[PDB]
């Protein structure tokens, strides 16, 4: 009944296309939620897509100026993976920052809403509010924007409070059936940890997070589920995964400290280890969220000064718009598969022919077989779409 | 299988955000029902949201003059909590006055419709009409407009028939599987009882109602399930919960009688006791249904002179529009949690920019943990919304 994730990691030679919602394309005719910060999380039967709605549809007067991340009307929308966020979509909680879990018995939703100085994180398990916690740093309390991990009924969530470049307090919360049973502060060599892409690595949980002040290498949070001990580091690959970043020739990583290379901003991304190698995804553009590529770096999880790419895949063409990406794990017959989603942001602050900001997603799953090439962009033409 | 609500009440330090439907904001683009008088009730698995529809969507020629309370086209809509009342919403009965019950086995719906002076109350259990009763005072027969409470298969509903400005005939109906097994005339010191917010206080049921005749203090109805005994009083707290009312300096309560302080009108509200203290919600504005606050009055359930407030939360900002509010109880793992909803009325007779009257809902649930501040209003811009 409680998911433990004790199976090994599936052998991955790459990723195969899994899902695509065409949300913006369907918005032109039809009522589709305005969403951002999506993620995918699966119960032991089927996968679900989540997103932070803006309390409006796209062909709506209220979709004007929907670029802001924190409004009182943002709610966590939840459909089956594949079903676009139509008007029948269930918004499961109030949140401008969210994280969702299925422990094998019920869904856990971590939902943060309220004032910036005074934010509340509500913990909803099996459809009921079981616990709530207030901001500890009295700043913008934020969480992963992706799936959290549960092992033996204990779910772990990374929550950050403070400024993304000033002092920020990151805590790991251990939640059992919606109740916060333990809270451990972040310890280790990583300092700015945000929007962690966490995945189960039995007997623990490993998170690859986003650094917003100093590093273009991604921080790593290792969580021992038994002892509740936290270890922090960075990804060792010389090909860093954060945007902005430096070229592949001029970039560097340290993987015990930030690389201090164009690290003053970031984007949510993912990476997972394959022995000494690392599978990672990033934008093709080093400065903007344009395009998306995945590849495997040889000894990129253990040795810095490694820039040996292999098995590169283009998920989104370099000319097309990408956004947040994250990892989610699907239990298989005999192993744990790693899958990822890419958020395809369309709209304001980069495309000024419309007044709204929204996204679609494309989902890829790890495969042991063969695959071809392609590109799966959003595909909506904003010049003809309602403004 | 039958719900007995035998668990104690959960320790409540306040309330955390639970749900927000954004109905009016989604109405601007998309087909959303025009509703009023909503409430929340939960089966042992999920929470559902109910509302009295007006037989029309908002972007509709029939949304004109939806400020009328009783029309032949009003039906009780029933969706999962979070799913907005879209066109796929099920209307479970014809009703301009409603109350819904889940006894642990099936849903009970008490639906009142027909002529104002010859109204019919239908009792629908497990999708069947089991019983029916006619208005006994030949005036507007009305009911709680919130969830009713079932203990051990016996559901109790409070029904009133009579005048809103004078003495009315209030009856308590004991219903078993849709069948009225007993009808008790209201007994006690409460003089006018209307729109009761009832919660299970095992072994009985406690209802906090509105006095529309002569009091701004809320009447209490105590119902013994085992004995079918009825006891009536008033919420003793000097900080009265009804609207209209006097200011916090001049408000008073008698704890046995109406306070005769701006008691000629009222709004549906809620209150529950925590030992000698009372947790109550009310509009921030004394005369209008603007804003919503929840707080705890120290010794407010026993002392008619206590005005000691604590644990105040702002649910809806002072300048924003509130409406009906009511209580609903959720069984947890070890106790019974108290949750409340607030109706966010928008439209006519207060906002003349539109021809329709409708509402949104925001839901909060009791919590033993910590929480911050915030405000969650309807948020629709009626100047740009279709009329």
């Amino acid at each position: 009944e409680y998911r433990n994730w004790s199976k090994p990691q599936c052998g991955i030679t790459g990723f195969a296309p899994f899902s695509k919602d065409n949300s913006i394309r369907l918005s032109a005719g039809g009522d589709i939620w305005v969403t951002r910060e999506p993620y995918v999380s699966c119960d032991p039967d089927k996968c679900y897509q989540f997103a932070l709605g803006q309390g409006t549809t796209l062909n709506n007067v209220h979709s004007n100026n929907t670029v802001r991340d924190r409004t009182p009307y943002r709610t966590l929308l939840m459909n089956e993976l594949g079903v676009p966020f139509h008007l029948g979509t269930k918004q499961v909680c109030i949140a401008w920052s969210s994280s969702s879990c299925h422990d094998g018995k019920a869904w856990l939703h971590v939902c943060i809403t309220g004032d910036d100085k005074n934010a509340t994180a509500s913990f909803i398990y099996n459809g009921r509010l079981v616990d709530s916690v207030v901001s500890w740093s009295k700043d913008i309390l934020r969480t992963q924007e992706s799936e959290c991990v549960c092992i033996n009924g204990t779910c772990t969530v990374v929550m950050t409070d403070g400024s993304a470049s000033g002092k920020a307090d990151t805590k790991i919360l251990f939640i059992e059936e919606g109740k916060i049973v333990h809270t451990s502060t972040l310890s280790g060599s990583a300092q700015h940890v945000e929007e962690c892409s966490c995945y189960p690595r039995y007997p623990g949980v490993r998170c690859v997070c986003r650094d917003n002040w100093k590093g273009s290498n991604r921080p790593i949070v290792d969580i021992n589920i038994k002892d509740h001990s936290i270890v922090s580091s960075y990804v060792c690959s010389g090909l860093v995964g954060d945007t902005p970043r430096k070229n592949d020739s001029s970039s560097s990583s340290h993987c015990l400290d930030p690389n201090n290379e164009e690290g003053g901003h970031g984007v949510k991304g993912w990476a997972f280890d394959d022995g000494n190698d690392v599978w990672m995804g990033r934008t093709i553009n080093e400065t903007s969220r344009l395009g998306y590529e995945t590849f495997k770096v040889i000894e990129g999880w253990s040795n810095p000064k490694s820039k040996l790419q292999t098995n590169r895949q283009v998920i989104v063409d370099r000319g097309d718009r990408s956004g947040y990406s994250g990892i989610f794990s699907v239990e298989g017959k005999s192993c744990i598969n790693r899958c990822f989603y890419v958020e395809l942001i369309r709209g304001r602050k980069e495309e000024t022919e419309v007044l709204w900001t929204s996204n679609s997603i494309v989902v890829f799953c790890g495969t042991s077989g063969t695959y071809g090439t392609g590109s799966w962009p959003d595909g909506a033409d904003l010049n003809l779409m309602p403004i | 299988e039958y719900r007995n609500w035998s668990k104690p009440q959960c320790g409540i330090t306040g309330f955390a955000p639970f749900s927000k439907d954004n109905s009016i904001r989604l109405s601007a683009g998309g087909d959303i029902w025009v509703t009023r008088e909503p409430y929340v009730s939960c089966d042992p698995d999920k929470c559902y949201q109910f509302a009295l529809g007006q037989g029309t969507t908002l972007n509709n020629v029939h949304s004109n003059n939806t400020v009328r309370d009783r029309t032949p086209y009003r039906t009780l809509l029933m969706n999962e909590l979070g799913v907005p009342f879209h066109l796929g919403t099920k209307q479970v009965c014809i009703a301009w006055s409603s109350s819904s019950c889940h006894d642990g086995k099936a849903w009970l719906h008490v639906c009142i419709t027909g002529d104002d002076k010859n109204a019919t109350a239908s009792f629908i259990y497990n999708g069947r009409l089991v019983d029916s009763v006619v208005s006994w005072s030949k005036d507007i027969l009305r009911t709680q407009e919130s969830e009713c409470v079932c203990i051990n298969g016996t559901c109790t509903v409070v029904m009133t028939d009579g005048s809103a400005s004078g003495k009315a005939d209030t009856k308590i109906l004991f219903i078993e599987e849709g069948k009225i097994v007993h009808t008790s005339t209201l007994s006690g010191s409460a003089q006018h009882v209307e729109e009761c917010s009832c919660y299970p206080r095992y072994p009985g049921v406690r209802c906090v109602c509105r006095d529309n005749w002569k009091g701004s203090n809320r009447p209490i109805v105590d119902i013994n399930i085992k004995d079918h005994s009825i006891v009536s009083s008033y919420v003793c707290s000097g900080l009265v919960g009804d609207t209209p009312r006097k200011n916090d300096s001049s408000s008073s309560s008698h704890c046995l009688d109406p306070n005769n302080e701006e008691g000629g009108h009222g709004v549906k509200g809620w209150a529950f006791d925590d030992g000698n203290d009372v947790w109550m919600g009310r509009t921030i504005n004394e005369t209008s249904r603007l804003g919503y606050e929840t707080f705890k009055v120290i010794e407010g359930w026993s002392n008619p002179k206590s005005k000691l407030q604590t644990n105040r939360q702002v649910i809806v900002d002072r300048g924003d529009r509130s409406g009906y509010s009511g209580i609903f109880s959720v069984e947890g793992k070890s106790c019974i949690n108290r949750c409340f909803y607030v109706e966010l009325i928008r439209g006519r007779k207060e906002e003349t920019e539109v021809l329709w009257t409708s509402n949104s809902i925001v839901v909060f649930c009791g919590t033993s943990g910590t929480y911050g501040t915030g405000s969650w209003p309807d948020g629709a811009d009626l100047n740009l919304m279709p009329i």
Partner: antibody
Framework: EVQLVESGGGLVQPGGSLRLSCAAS????????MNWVRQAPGKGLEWVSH????????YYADSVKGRFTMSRDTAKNSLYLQMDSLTVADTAVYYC????????????????WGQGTTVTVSS | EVVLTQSPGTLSLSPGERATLSCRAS???????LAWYQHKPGQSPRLLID???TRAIGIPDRFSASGSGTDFTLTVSRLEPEDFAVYYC????????FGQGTKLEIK
């Protein structure tokens, strides 16, 4: 619709005190950064002070540091600039400006401005 | 200690030419936290360009801006009698600083 209205400007004696107030109409102070910007007569815009949506004062102009106190009260949705020991280099039109900090995108430009209030320090 | 230097001063054109407004930073900003404002006399300053490249909501399509590093440019493609005002470039990253401004005159 959103609006910013300042008040409290007027003649002040050099070495005196004045409290400027700016009120918000449509939006909420709990999610926006707020700023004070002054324009000296015959000079360009100067950023006086900046307060976060969390209530912390990130920035003070070097000239006004130690003399100007900027605060807010989210209950009344009002912004305050307590000016102390005013000199002749403080007479200017004072603007309360609003910009946003995005969790994802960081800071944005100051898109909402008030009408402006005039402070005159003479003799 | 960035010093936002607006290269053109008291520039004069005609209703329909192209305006080239320059803003030079003493040192590399390190981010896109460069904004342009329009300040007509007797009116509140109006945000035109945010992020050194993004036009604000409701700003006419004529206003466009570009640049990075130290040099940032604002260009009005076709002048109109409304577009004659004082233009400021602001660095809303650390350290906060405004530009001295540049005014458009009628010829």
């Amino acid at each position: 619709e959103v609006q910013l209205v300042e008040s409290g400007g007027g003649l002040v004696q050099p070495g005196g005190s004045l409290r400027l107030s700016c009120a918000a109409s449509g939006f909420s102070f709990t999610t926006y950064e707020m700023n004070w910007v002054r324009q000296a007569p015959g000079k360009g815009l100067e950023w006086v002070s900046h307060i976060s949506s969390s209530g912390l004062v990130i920035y003070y102009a070097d000239s006004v540091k130690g003399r100007f106190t900027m605060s807010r009260d989210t209950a009344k949705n009002s912004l305050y600039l307590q000016m102390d020991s005013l000199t002749v280099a403080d007479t200017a039109v004072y603007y309360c400006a609003r910009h946003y900090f995005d969790r994802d995108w960081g800071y944005s430009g100051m898109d909402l401005w008030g009408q402006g209030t005039t402070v005159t320090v003479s003799s | 200690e960035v010093v936002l230097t607006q290269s053109p001063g008291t520039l004069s054109l005609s209703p329909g030419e192209r305006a080239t407004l320059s803003c030079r930073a003493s040192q590399s900003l390190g981010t896109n936290y460069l904004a342009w404002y329009q300040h007509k006399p007797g009116q509140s300053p109006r945000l035109l360009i945010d992020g050194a490249s993004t036009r604000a909501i409701g700003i006419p399509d004529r206003f466009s801006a570009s640049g990075s590093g130290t040099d940032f440019t604002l260009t009005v493609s076709r002048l109109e009698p409304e577009d004659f005002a004082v233009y400021y470039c602001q660095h809303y990253g650390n350290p906060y600083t405004f530009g001295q401004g540049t005014k458009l005159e009628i010829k």
